[PDB]
Write an enzyme that holds these catalytic residues in place. Structure first.
Site, PDB file in Angstrom:
ATOM      1  N   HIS A  45       0.827  -1.205   0.000  1.00 51.47           N
ATOM      2  CA  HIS A  45       0.000   0.000   0.000  1.00 51.47           C
ATOM      3  C   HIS A  45       0.865   1.260   0.000  1.00 51.47           C
ATOM      4  O   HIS A  45       0.407   2.318  -0.418  1.00 51.47           O
ATOM      5  CB  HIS A  45      -1.015  -0.031   1.157  1.00 51.47           C
ATOM      6  CG  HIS A  45      -0.486   0.410   2.483  1.00 51.47           C
ATOM      7  ND1 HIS A  45      -0.190  -0.461   3.513  1.00 51.47           N
ATOM      8  CD2 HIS A  45      -0.257   1.657   2.965  1.00 51.47           C
ATOM      9  CE1 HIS A  45       0.217   0.235   4.563  1.00 51.47           C
ATOM     10  NE2 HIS A  45       0.189   1.527   4.258  1.00 51.47           N
ATOM     11  N   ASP A  93      -0.173  -7.561   1.765  1.00 51.32           N
ATOM     12  CA  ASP A  93       0.353  -6.186   1.819  1.00 51.32           C
ATOM     13  C   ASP A  93       1.880  -6.232   1.918  1.00 51.32           C
ATOM     14  O   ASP A  93       2.453  -6.038   2.979  1.00 51.32           O
ATOM     15  CB  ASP A  93      -0.280  -5.395   2.971  1.00 51.32           C
ATOM     16  CG  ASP A  93      -0.081  -3.888   2.838  1.00 51.32           C
ATOM     17  OD1 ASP A  93      -0.462  -3.157   3.785  1.00 51.32           O
ATOM     18  OD2 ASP A  93       0.490  -3.458   1.827  1.00 51.32           O
ATOM     19  N   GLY A 186       2.930   6.583   8.458  1.00 46.06           N
ATOM     20  CA  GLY A 186       4.331   6.848   8.210  1.00 46.06           C
ATOM     21  C   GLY A 186       5.207   5.722   8.688  1.00 46.06           C
ATOM     22  O   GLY A 186       6.370   5.672   8.327  1.00 46.06           O
ATOM     23  N   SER A 188       4.128   2.490   8.182  1.00 50.40           N
ATOM     24  CA  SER A 188       3.770   1.400   7.282  1.00 50.40           C
ATOM     25  C   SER A 188       4.914   0.972   6.464  1.00 50.40           C
ATOM     26  O   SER A 188       5.741   1.795   6.066  1.00 50.40           O
ATOM     27  CB  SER A 188       2.674   1.786   6.319  1.00 50.40           C
ATOM     28  OG  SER A 188       1.484   1.977   7.034  1.00 50.40           O
ATOM     29  N   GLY A 189       5.020  -0.317   6.258  1.00 51.69           N
ATOM     30  CA  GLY A 189       6.092  -0.865   5.463  1.00 51.69           C
ATOM     31  C   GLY A 189       7.331  -1.183   6.251  1.00 51.69           C
ATOM     32  O   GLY A 189       8.159  -1.971   5.742  1.00 51.69           O
TER      33      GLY A 189
END
Ligand code: NA
Length: 240
Positions: A45, A93, A186, A188-189
């Site tokens: 995402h 994801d 911020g 995420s990932g």
């Protein structure tokens, strides 16, 4: 990261900052984990938008020269083929970014170690989330890399009705949910680092939090479970 503490600058050398070009500048958008000298693992995402991305390794303070950064462009983006941006709760994801150059390894820049395929953490396992994400719900990005201690919440609990119910899948890891500490926008990932047999490994890729806020009791931060995607990751790297 809400309720975090500043990380020491050599604690999490596989953490990267994923940034996009914003006018004459670059802006942090997501985290990620360096998994080869020329590959980064992040959330799908995070790379939904048609932006120009770069990765920064060896970053500590987004807003100051650390003397340790390497800046590299993203050459190829490979998102999991089952990812649906209309449906984060379905899972998948995860994305891999091939870098334009191979980065140089040092005490600030190291490959993240991944768990063995199929590994599932016991309930309440010790983990840290790291990132530069918002420090409060509807707040602002951290300047310096933050960490927060988020013990895992196993699938049976996380998928129960007062937690996430059906929204959490077995291909995810949940951690936290104490109402004080969490991931936030911020983050995420980026990685969830869990201590197993004496060694930190990256067990999660930060995926989502509640729409009611970041740090919400019984809504632990939800991560893609890296150990479910080992074959996928290896297949992508081998074919690129
Ligand atoms: Na910096």
């Amino acid at each position: 990261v809400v309720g975090g503490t500043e990380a020491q600058r050599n604690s999490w050398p596989s953490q990267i900052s994923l940034q996009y070009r914003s006018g004459s500048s670059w802006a942090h958008t997501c985290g990620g984990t360096l998994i080869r000298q020329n590959w980064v693992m992040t959330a799908a995402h995070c790379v939904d938008r048609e932006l120009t991305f770069r990765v920064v390794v060896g970053e500590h303070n987004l807003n100051q020269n650390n003397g340790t950064e390497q800046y590299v462009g993203v050459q190829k983006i490979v998102v999991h083929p089952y990812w649906n941006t209309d449906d984060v709760a379905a899972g998948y994801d995860i994305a891999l970014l091939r870098l334009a150059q191979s980065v140089t390894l040092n005490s600030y820049v190291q490959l993240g170690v991944l768990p063995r395929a199929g590994t599932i953490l016991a309930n309440n396992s010790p983990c840290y989330i790291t990132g530069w994400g918002l420090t409060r719900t509807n707040g602002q990005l951290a300047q310096t890399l933050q960490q927060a201690y988020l013990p895992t919440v196993d699938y049976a609990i996380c998928s129960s009705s007062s937690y996430w119910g059906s929204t959490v899948k077995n291909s995810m890891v949940c951690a936290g949910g104490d109402g004080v500490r969490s991931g936030c926008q911020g983050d995420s990932g980026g990685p969830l680092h869990c201590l197993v047999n004496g060694q930190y490994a990256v067990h999660g890729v930060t995926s989502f939090v509640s729409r009611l806020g970041c740090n919400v009791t019984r809504k632990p931060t939800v991560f893609t479970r890296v150990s479910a995607y080992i074959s996928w990751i290896n297949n992508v790297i081998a074919s690129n």
